Amino acid sequence: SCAIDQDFLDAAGILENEAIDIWNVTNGKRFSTYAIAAERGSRIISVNGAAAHCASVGDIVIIASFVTMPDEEARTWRPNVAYFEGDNEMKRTA
Amino acid sequence: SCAIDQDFLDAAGILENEAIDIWNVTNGKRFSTYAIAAERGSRIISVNGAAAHCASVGDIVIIASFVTMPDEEARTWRPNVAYFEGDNEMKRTA
Amino acid sequence: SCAIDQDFLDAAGILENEAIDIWNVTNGKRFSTYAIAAERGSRIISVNGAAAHCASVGDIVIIASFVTMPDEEARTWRPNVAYFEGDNEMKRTA
Amino acid sequence: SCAIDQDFLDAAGILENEAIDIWNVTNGKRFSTYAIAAERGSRIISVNGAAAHCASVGDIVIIASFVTMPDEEARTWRPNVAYFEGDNEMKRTA
Amino acid sequence: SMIRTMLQGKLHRVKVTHADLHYEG
Amino acid sequence: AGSMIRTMLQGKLHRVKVTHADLHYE
Amino acid sequence: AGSMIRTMLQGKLHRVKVTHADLHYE
Amino acid sequence: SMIRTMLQGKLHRVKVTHADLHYEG
């Protein structure tokens, strides 16, 4: 799986047990898993089990989730985006 | 395709002919196929056809199925997890 | 894309413009594209554009499509399977 | 993420923030991301973040979006196709 | 409200007859 | 009506061992 | 009610050329 | 009846803090 600080899940609207895509900016690897909650305020991003083959400690990644809805709603849909730098410090927008 | 002991399918709530993801903990390979029922009590995990390129006898794998549901149901959803050790001996907890 | 003899599409219930998974038994490669109709009786399987990087003439492949439906219907669902040998000769079951 | 001239998005019926598949005809790489709108008339195709590992300036790509619909609607469905040549010059036909 | 992804159909062990990198369609 | 739909882990077999591999399955 | 749902090509940009690549996009 | 797949949300450029191959959960 991937364990993620609950504060980060809250900001991005990602649920525990939700399908997520992980896109590794460092090594270019792309894979799909599901989200686990890590302790609130821990700033943890932990790649667990088979996913440990696709990312190393220090790798920069983008974690995304996708939802379906009818075309009429999709035209005005607004994704939940959280921005980070340094040691998983979330930039002021939350 | 992947043939799985019907007892294991029951425990994980996976249906015959359902889409499954297989995550190979041993070699890091990740692939999508569908579930075939093997004889109840056989403890079979058989990787058939092209999937035999992605897993070998003795490899440790995670087999996952994903379902879609509205957000409210998703927020209290509890996945069906079966844990394994030894001779594909199933337990309810880790 | 992948162009497929309309007789084969008919047997497997695969539609023109439907998402398909191609699992290459020869080289182990796995990719997703969409189905195109080839001439009825031609027995053509043509890998077009970017997909030409993932299969060669003579490679043995499995072509699959997936649908969604509620759990209640999924429990009794019956896939449409066509079996082949030799030069794309469909075995008697259609 | 992939930034695309809004005119191109219009022609293919692709929405901003919609899931897209990118199939690289030049190098054979296949990946899934989401669409970002670029300025109308810019003729931009910009591969951003981790996706920059999968495509380079000058690479020829197919960008596809997939929708779900019931079988009856699927059987008469006509996809929105835009064809390109030269300086990302768009045409209705090949 | 639980929706399953199920195998619709498959062509089992067909052979690739043609490869067209420069396809326009 | 127009509900936003999530993709959720339904269930999993955690660390099961592969017992058979058959390239030529029919 | 319980309709079988297909995944269909909605549309495509056929043989467009990549104009920009930005690893460090924010 | 046309259903779209849309970006729900993303964490942009987080760093992996831990890798656990032998995770049991």
Coordinates of C-alpha atoms in Angstrom, one line a residue:
Chain A
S1 CA 0.0 0.0 0.0
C2 CA 1.0 3.7 0.6
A3 CA 0.6 5.1 4.2
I4 CA -0.1 8.9 4.1
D5 CA -0.3 11.5 6.9
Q6 CA -4.2 11.9 7.4
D7 CA -3.7 15.8 7.1
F8 CA -2.5 15.2 3.5
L9 CA -5.4 12.8 2.8
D10 CA -7.8 15.5 4.2
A11 CA -6.3 18.2 1.9
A12 CA -6.5 16.0 -1.3
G13 CA -9.9 14.4 -0.5
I14 CA -8.2 10.9 -0.7
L15 CA -9.9 8.2 1.4
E16 CA -8.4 5.3 3.4
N17 CA -8.7 2.2 1.1
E18 CA -9.2 4.4 -2.1
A19 CA -7.3 3.4 -5.3
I20 CA -4.4 5.8 -5.9
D21 CA -1.9 6.3 -8.8
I22 CA 1.8 7.1 -7.8
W23 CA 3.9 8.9 -10.4
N24 CA 7.6 8.9 -9.4
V25 CA 9.3 12.2 -10.6
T26 CA 12.8 10.9 -9.5
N27 CA 12.9 7.5 -11.4
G28 CA 9.8 7.9 -13.8
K29 CA 8.1 4.7 -12.5
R30 CA 4.2 4.8 -12.5
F31 CA 2.1 2.3 -10.4
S32 CA -1.4 1.9 -8.8
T33 CA -2.1 0.9 -5.2
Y34 CA -4.5 2.0 -2.4
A35 CA -4.1 4.7 0.4
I36 CA -3.6 3.9 4.1
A37 CA -3.8 6.6 6.9
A38 CA -0.6 7.5 8.7
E39 CA -0.6 9.4 12.0
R40 CA -1.9 13.0 11.7
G41 CA 1.1 15.5 11.7
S42 CA 3.7 12.7 11.0
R43 CA 4.3 14.0 7.4
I44 CA 4.8 10.2 6.5
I45 CA 4.7 8.9 2.9
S46 CA 5.5 5.1 3.3
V47 CA 5.6 2.7 0.3
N48 CA 4.6 -0.7 1.7
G49 CA 5.1 -4.3 0.4
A50 CA 5.4 -4.8 -3.5
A51 CA 5.3 -0.9 -4.0
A52 CA 8.7 -0.8 -2.1
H53 CA 10.2 -2.0 -5.5
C54 CA 8.9 1.2 -7.3
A55 CA 10.1 4.0 -4.8
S56 CA 13.1 4.7 -2.5
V57 CA 13.3 7.0 0.6
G58 CA 13.8 10.6 -0.8
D59 CA 12.1 10.0 -4.1
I60 CA 9.7 12.9 -5.2
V61 CA 6.2 11.5 -6.2
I62 CA 2.8 12.7 -7.2
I63 CA -0.1 10.8 -5.6
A64 CA -3.5 11.1 -7.5
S65 CA -7.0 9.6 -7.1
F66 CA -9.8 9.6 -9.8
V67 CA -13.6 9.6 -9.5
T68 CA -16.4 9.1 -12.1
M69 CA -19.4 11.3 -12.7
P70 CA -21.7 12.3 -15.5
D71 CA -20.4 14.6 -18.3
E72 CA -22.7 17.5 -17.1
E73 CA -21.0 17.6 -13.6
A74 CA -17.5 16.8 -15.0
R75 CA -17.5 20.1 -17.1
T76 CA -17.3 22.2 -13.8
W77 CA -15.5 19.6 -11.5
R78 CA -12.7 21.1 -9.3
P79 CA -9.9 18.7 -8.1
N80 CA -8.4 18.9 -4.5
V81 CA -4.7 19.8 -4.9
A82 CA -2.1 20.0 -2.1
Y83 CA 1.4 21.5 -2.9
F84 CA 4.6 20.5 -1.0
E85 CA 8.3 21.4 -0.8
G86 CA 11.2 20.5 1.6
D87 CA 10.4 17.8 4.1
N88 CA 6.6 17.3 3.1
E89 CA 5.8 20.9 4.2
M90 CA 2.3 21.6 2.8
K91 CA 2.2 25.2 1.2
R92 CA -0.5 27.7 2.6
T93 CA -3.8 26.8 0.8
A94 CA -5.3 24.6 3.7
Chain B
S1 CA -5.7 -15.5 -15.7
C2 CA -5.3 -16.6 -12.0
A3 CA -7.0 -19.7 -10.6
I4 CA -7.6 -19.2 -6.8
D5 CA -9.0 -21.7 -4.1
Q6 CA -12.8 -20.8 -3.9
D7 CA -12.3 -20.6 0.0
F8 CA -9.7 -17.7 -0.6
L9 CA -12.1 -16.0 -3.1
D10 CA -14.9 -16.3 -0.4
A11 CA -12.7 -14.7 2.4
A12 CA -11.6 -11.7 0.1
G13 CA -15.1 -11.3 -1.4
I14 CA -13.6 -11.8 -4.9
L15 CA -16.0 -13.3 -7.6
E16 CA -15.1 -15.7 -10.4
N17 CA -14.4 -13.6 -13.6
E18 CA -13.8 -10.4 -11.5
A19 CA -10.9 -8.1 -12.6
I20 CA -7.9 -8.5 -10.1
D21 CA -4.6 -6.7 -9.6
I22 CA -1.6 -8.9 -8.7
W23 CA 1.4 -7.2 -6.9
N24 CA 4.5 -9.5 -6.8
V25 CA 6.3 -8.8 -3.5
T26 CA 9.2 -11.1 -4.6
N27 CA 10.1 -9.5 -8.0
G28 CA 8.1 -6.1 -7.9
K29 CA 6.0 -6.9 -11.1
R30 CA 2.5 -5.5 -11.1
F31 CA -0.3 -6.7 -13.5
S32 CA -4.1 -6.9 -14.0
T33 CA -5.9 -10.1 -14.9
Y34 CA -9.2 -11.8 -13.8
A35 CA -10.0 -14.5 -11.1
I36 CA -10.8 -18.2 -12.0
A37 CA -12.2 -20.4 -9.2
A38 CA -10.0 -23.4 -8.2
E39 CA -11.3 -26.4 -6.2
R40 CA -12.4 -25.5 -2.6
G41 CA -9.5 -26.6 -0.2
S42 CA -6.9 -27.0 -3.1
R43 CA -5.0 -23.8 -1.7
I44 CA -4.2 -23.2 -5.5
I45 CA -2.7 -19.9 -6.7
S46 CA -2.1 -20.7 -10.5
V47 CA -0.8 -17.9 -12.8
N48 CA -2.0 -18.9 -16.3
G49 CA -1.3 -17.7 -19.9
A50 CA 0.8 -14.4 -20.4
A51 CA 0.7 -13.8 -16.5
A52 CA 3.2 -16.8 -16.2
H53 CA 5.8 -14.2 -17.4
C54 CA 5.1 -12.1 -14.3
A55 CA 5.1 -14.7 -11.5
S56 CA 6.9 -18.0 -10.6
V57 CA 6.1 -20.9 -8.2
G58 CA 7.2 -19.7 -4.7
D59 CA 6.7 -15.9 -5.4
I60 CA 4.8 -14.0 -2.6
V61 CA 1.9 -11.9 -4.2
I62 CA -0.9 -9.6 -3.1
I63 CA -4.2 -10.2 -5.1
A64 CA -6.6 -7.2 -4.9
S65 CA -10.1 -6.5 -6.3
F66 CA -11.5 -2.9 -6.5
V67 CA -15.2 -1.9 -6.6
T68 CA -16.9 1.5 -7.3
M69 CA -19.4 3.1 -4.9
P70 CA -20.7 6.6 -4.0
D71 CA -18.5 8.8 -1.7
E72 CA -20.7 8.4 1.4
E73 CA -20.5 4.6 1.2
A74 CA -16.7 4.8 0.4
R75 CA -16.1 6.8 3.6
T76 CA -17.3 3.9 6.0
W77 CA -16.3 1.0 3.6
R78 CA -14.4 -2.0 5.2
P79 CA -12.3 -4.1 2.7
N80 CA -12.4 -8.0 3.0
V81 CA -8.7 -8.9 3.9
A82 CA -7.3 -12.5 4.2
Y83 CA -3.8 -12.9 5.6
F84 CA -1.6 -15.9 4.6
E85 CA 1.5 -17.8 6.0
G86 CA 3.2 -21.1 5.5
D87 CA 1.3 -23.6 3.1
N88 CA -1.2 -20.8 2.0
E89 CA -2.7 -21.1 5.5
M90 CA -5.4 -18.4 5.8
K91 CA -6.0 -16.2 8.9
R92 CA -8.5 -13.3 9.7
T93 CA -5.8 -11.1 11.4
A94 CA -2.0 -10.3 11.0
Chain C
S1 CA -5.4 0.4 -32.0
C2 CA -5.9 -3.3 -32.7
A3 CA -8.0 -4.3 -35.8
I4 CA -9.9 -7.6 -35.3
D5 CA -11.9 -9.8 -37.7
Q6 CA -15.6 -8.8 -37.0
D7 CA -16.4 -12.6 -36.6
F8 CA -14.0 -12.7 -33.6
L9 CA -15.5 -9.4 -32.1
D10 CA -19.0 -11.0 -32.6
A11 CA -17.9 -14.3 -30.7
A12 CA -16.3 -12.4 -27.8
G13 CA -19.0 -9.6 -27.6
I14 CA -16.2 -6.9 -28.1
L15 CA -17.4 -3.7 -29.7
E16 CA -15.7 -1.4 -32.2
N17 CA -14.1 1.5 -30.1
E18 CA -14.3 -0.6 -26.8
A19 CA -11.3 -0.5 -24.4
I20 CA -9.4 -3.8 -24.7
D21 CA -6.4 -5.4 -22.8
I22 CA -3.8 -7.3 -24.8
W23 CA -1.7 -9.8 -22.9
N24 CA 1.2 -11.1 -25.1
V25 CA 1.9 -14.8 -24.3
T26 CA 5.1 -14.8 -26.5
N27 CA 7.0 -11.8 -24.9
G28 CA 5.0 -11.2 -21.6
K29 CA 4.1 -7.5 -22.5
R30 CA 0.7 -6.3 -21.3
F31 CA -1.0 -3.1 -22.7
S32 CA -4.4 -1.4 -23.1
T33 CA -5.8 0.0 -26.4
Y34 CA -9.2 0.0 -28.2
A35 CA -10.7 -2.5 -30.8
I36 CA -11.2 -1.7 -34.5
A37 CA -13.2 -4.0 -36.9
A38 CA -11.3 -5.8 -39.6
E39 CA -13.0 -7.4 -42.7
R40 CA -15.3 -10.4 -41.7
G41 CA -13.6 -13.7 -42.5
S42 CA -10.1 -12.1 -42.9
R43 CA -8.9 -13.7 -39.5
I44 CA -6.8 -10.4 -39.1
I45 CA -5.2 -9.4 -35.8
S46 CA -3.4 -6.1 -36.6
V47 CA -1.5 -4.0 -33.9
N48 CA -1.6 -0.4 -35.2
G49 CA 0.5 2.7 -34.3
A50 CA 2.2 2.8 -30.8
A51 CA 0.9 -0.8 -30.0
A52 CA 3.3 -2.1 -32.8
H53 CA 6.1 -1.6 -30.2
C54 CA 4.4 -4.3 -27.9
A55 CA 3.7 -7.1 -30.4
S56 CA 5.3 -8.7 -33.6
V57 CA 3.7 -10.7 -36.4
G58 CA 3.3 -14.4 -35.1
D59 CA 3.1 -13.4 -31.4
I60 CA 0.3 -15.3 -29.5
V61 CA -1.9 -12.9 -27.5
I62 CA -5.1 -12.9 -25.3
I63 CA -7.5 -9.9 -26.0
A64 CA -9.9 -9.2 -23.2
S65 CA -12.7 -6.5 -22.5
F66 CA -14.2 -5.7 -19.1
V67 CA -17.7 -4.3 -18.1
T68 CA -19.1 -3.0 -14.8
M69 CA -22.4 -4.1 -13.2
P70 CA -23.8 -4.3 -9.6
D71 CA -22.6 -7.2 -7.3
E72 CA -26.0 -9.0 -7.5
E73 CA -25.7 -9.4 -11.4
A74 CA -21.8 -10.0 -11.2
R75 CA -22.4 -13.2 -9.1
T76 CA -24.0 -15.0 -12.1
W77 CA -22.2 -13.2 -15.0
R78 CA -20.9 -15.4 -17.9
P79 CA -18.0 -14.0 -20.1
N80 CA -18.0 -14.5 -23.9
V81 CA -14.9 -16.7 -24.7
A82 CA -13.6 -17.7 -28.2
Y83 CA -10.8 -20.3 -28.4
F84 CA -8.2 -20.4 -31.3
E85 CA -5.3 -22.5 -32.6
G86 CA -3.2 -22.6 -35.9
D87 CA -3.8 -19.5 -38.2
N88 CA -6.6 -17.9 -36.1
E89 CA -9.0 -20.9 -36.6
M90 CA -11.8 -20.4 -34.1
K91 CA -12.7 -23.8 -32.4
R92 CA -16.3 -25.1 -32.6
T93 CA -18.4 -23.2 -29.9
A94 CA -19.8 -20.5 -32.3
Chain D
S1 CA 0.0 16.0 -16.2
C2 CA -0.3 17.0 -19.9
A3 CA -1.2 20.6 -21.0
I4 CA -3.1 20.7 -24.3
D5 CA -4.3 23.6 -26.5
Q6 CA -8.0 24.1 -25.5
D7 CA -8.9 24.0 -29.3
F8 CA -7.5 20.4 -29.4
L9 CA -9.4 19.4 -26.2
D10 CA -12.6 20.8 -27.8
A11 CA -12.1 18.8 -31.1
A12 CA -11.5 15.5 -29.1
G13 CA -14.2 16.2 -26.5
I14 CA -11.6 16.0 -23.7
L15 CA -12.3 18.0 -20.5
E16 CA -9.8 19.8 -18.3
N17 CA -8.9 17.4 -15.4
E18 CA -10.1 14.3 -17.4
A19 CA -8.1 11.1 -17.2
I20 CA -6.1 10.6 -20.4
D21 CA -4.0 7.7 -21.9
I22 CA -0.8 8.8 -23.8
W23 CA 0.6 6.3 -26.3
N24 CA 4.1 7.3 -27.6
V25 CA 4.4 6.2 -31.2
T26 CA 8.1 7.3 -31.2
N27 CA 9.4 5.3 -28.2
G28 CA 6.4 2.9 -27.5
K29 CA 5.9 4.1 -23.9
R30 CA 2.3 4.0 -22.6
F31 CA 1.1 6.0 -19.5
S32 CA -2.1 7.4 -17.9
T33 CA -2.3 11.0 -16.6
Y34 CA -4.9 13.9 -16.7
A35 CA -5.5 16.8 -19.1
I36 CA -4.7 20.5 -18.3
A37 CA -6.0 23.2 -20.7
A38 CA -3.3 25.3 -22.5
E39 CA -4.1 28.7 -24.1
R40 CA -6.4 28.5 -27.1
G41 CA -4.3 28.6 -30.4
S42 CA -1.0 27.9 -28.5
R43 CA -0.9 24.4 -30.2
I44 CA 0.9 23.3 -26.9
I45 CA 1.4 19.6 -26.0
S46 CA 3.4 19.9 -22.7
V47 CA 4.3 16.7 -20.7
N48 CA 4.8 17.8 -17.1
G49 CA 6.1 16.2 -13.8
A50 CA 6.9 12.4 -13.8
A51 CA 5.4 12.1 -17.4
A52 CA 8.5 14.0 -18.7
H53 CA 10.3 10.6 -18.2
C54 CA 8.0 9.0 -20.8
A55 CA 8.0 11.6 -23.7
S56 CA 10.4 14.2 -25.2
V57 CA 9.9 17.3 -27.5
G58 CA 9.4 16.0 -31.0
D59 CA 7.8 12.6 -30.0
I60 CA 4.6 11.7 -31.9
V61 CA 1.9 10.6 -29.4
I62 CA -1.8 9.5 -29.4
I63 CA -3.9 11.1 -26.5
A64 CA -7.1 9.2 -25.7
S65 CA -9.9 9.6 -23.2
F66 CA -12.4 6.8 -22.3
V67 CA -16.0 7.2 -21.0
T68 CA -18.5 4.6 -19.7
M69 CA -22.0 4.0 -21.0
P70 CA -24.6 1.2 -21.2
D71 CA -24.2 -1.4 -24.0
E72 CA -27.0 -0.1 -26.3
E73 CA -25.4 3.5 -26.4
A74 CA -21.9 1.9 -26.8
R75 CA -23.1 -0.1 -29.9
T76 CA -23.8 3.2 -31.9
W77 CA -21.2 5.4 -30.2
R78 CA -19.0 7.6 -32.5
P79 CA -15.6 8.8 -30.9
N80 CA -14.4 12.4 -31.4
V81 CA -11.2 12.1 -33.5
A82 CA -8.8 14.9 -34.4
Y83 CA -5.9 14.2 -36.9
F84 CA -2.6 16.1 -36.8
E85 CA 0.3 16.9 -39.2
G86 CA 3.1 19.4 -39.5
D87 CA 3.1 22.2 -36.8
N88 CA 0.3 20.4 -34.8
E89 CA -2.1 21.4 -37.6
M90 CA -5.5 19.8 -36.9
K91 CA -7.8 18.2 -39.5
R92 CA -11.2 16.4 -39.3
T93 CA -10.2 13.5 -41.6
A94 CA -7.1 11.4 -42.4
Chain E
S1 CA -24.5 0.2 -4.7
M2 CA -21.3 -1.9 -5.0
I3 CA -20.2 -2.1 -8.7
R4 CA -17.9 -5.0 -9.9
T5 CA -15.5 -5.0 -12.9
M6 CA -16.0 -8.3 -14.7
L7 CA -14.5 -10.0 -17.7
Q8 CA -16.9 -9.3 -20.6
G9 CA -15.2 -11.6 -23.2
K10 CA -11.8 -12.7 -24.5
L11 CA -10.1 -14.0 -27.6
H12 CA -7.8 -16.8 -26.3
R13 CA -4.4 -17.3 -28.1
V14 CA -5.0 -15.4 -31.4
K15 CA -1.9 -14.7 -33.5
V16 CA -0.8 -11.2 -34.5
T17 CA -1.1 -11.1 -38.4
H18 CA 0.1 -7.5 -39.0
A19 CA 2.0 -4.6 -37.3
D20 CA 1.4 -1.1 -38.6
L21 CA 3.4 1.6 -36.7
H22 CA 2.4 4.4 -39.2
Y23 CA -1.4 3.6 -39.1
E24 CA -3.6 6.7 -39.7
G25 CA -7.1 6.1 -38.2
Chain F
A1 CA -28.3 11.5 -9.2
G2 CA -24.8 12.5 -10.6
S3 CA -23.2 11.1 -7.5
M4 CA -19.3 11.3 -7.5
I5 CA -18.1 7.6 -7.6
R6 CA -15.0 6.3 -5.8
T7 CA -12.8 3.3 -6.7
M8 CA -12.2 1.4 -3.4
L9 CA -10.2 -1.7 -2.3
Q10 CA -13.0 -4.4 -2.1
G11 CA -10.7 -7.1 -0.7
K12 CA -7.3 -8.7 -0.9
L13 CA -5.3 -11.9 -0.4
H14 CA -2.3 -10.7 1.5
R15 CA 1.1 -12.5 0.8
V16 CA -0.4 -15.7 -0.7
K17 CA 2.3 -17.9 -2.4
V18 CA 2.1 -18.9 -6.2
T19 CA 1.6 -22.7 -6.4
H20 CA 1.5 -23.2 -10.2
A21 CA 2.5 -21.3 -13.5
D22 CA 1.1 -22.5 -16.9
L23 CA 2.2 -20.4 -20.0
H24 CA 0.2 -22.8 -22.3
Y25 CA -3.1 -22.7 -20.4
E26 CA -6.2 -23.3 -22.7
Chain G
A1 CA -31.4 -0.9 -13.6
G2 CA -28.2 -3.2 -13.3
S3 CA -27.3 -2.3 -16.9
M4 CA -23.9 -3.7 -18.1
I5 CA -21.5 -0.7 -18.6
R6 CA -18.9 -0.5 -21.4
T7 CA -15.6 1.4 -21.4
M8 CA -15.5 3.2 -24.9
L9 CA -13.0 5.5 -26.6
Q10 CA -14.6 9.0 -26.1
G11 CA -12.1 10.8 -28.4
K12 CA -8.4 11.1 -29.3
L13 CA -5.7 13.4 -30.6
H14 CA -4.1 11.3 -33.4
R15 CA -0.3 11.8 -33.9
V16 CA 0.1 15.2 -32.2
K17 CA 3.7 16.2 -31.5
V18 CA 5.1 17.0 -27.9
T19 CA 6.1 20.7 -27.8
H20 CA 7.4 20.9 -24.2
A21 CA 8.6 18.6 -21.3
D22 CA 8.9 20.1 -17.7
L23 CA 10.1 17.6 -15.1
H24 CA 10.0 20.3 -12.3
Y25 CA 6.4 21.5 -13.1
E26 CA 4.6 23.0 -10.0
Chain H
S1 CA -25.5 8.5 -19.7
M2 CA -21.8 9.4 -20.6
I3 CA -19.6 9.0 -17.4
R4 CA -16.2 10.8 -17.2
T5 CA -13.1 9.7 -15.2
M6 CA -11.8 13.0 -13.5
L7 CA -8.9 13.8 -11.2
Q8 CA -10.4 13.9 -7.7
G9 CA -7.3 15.2 -6.0
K10 CA -3.5 15.0 -5.8
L11 CA -0.5 15.4 -3.5
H12 CA 2.1 17.3 -5.6
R13 CA 5.8 16.5 -5.1
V14 CA 5.7 14.7 -1.7
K15 CA 8.9 12.8 -0.6
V16 CA 8.9 9.1 0.2
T17 CA 9.9 8.9 4.0
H18 CA 9.8 5.1 4.4
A19 CA 9.9 1.8 2.3
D20 CA 8.6 -1.4 4.0
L21 CA 8.8 -4.5 1.7
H22 CA 7.7 -6.9 4.6
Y23 CA 4.6 -4.8 5.6
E24 CA 1.8 -7.0 7.1
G25 CA -1.6 -5.0 6.7

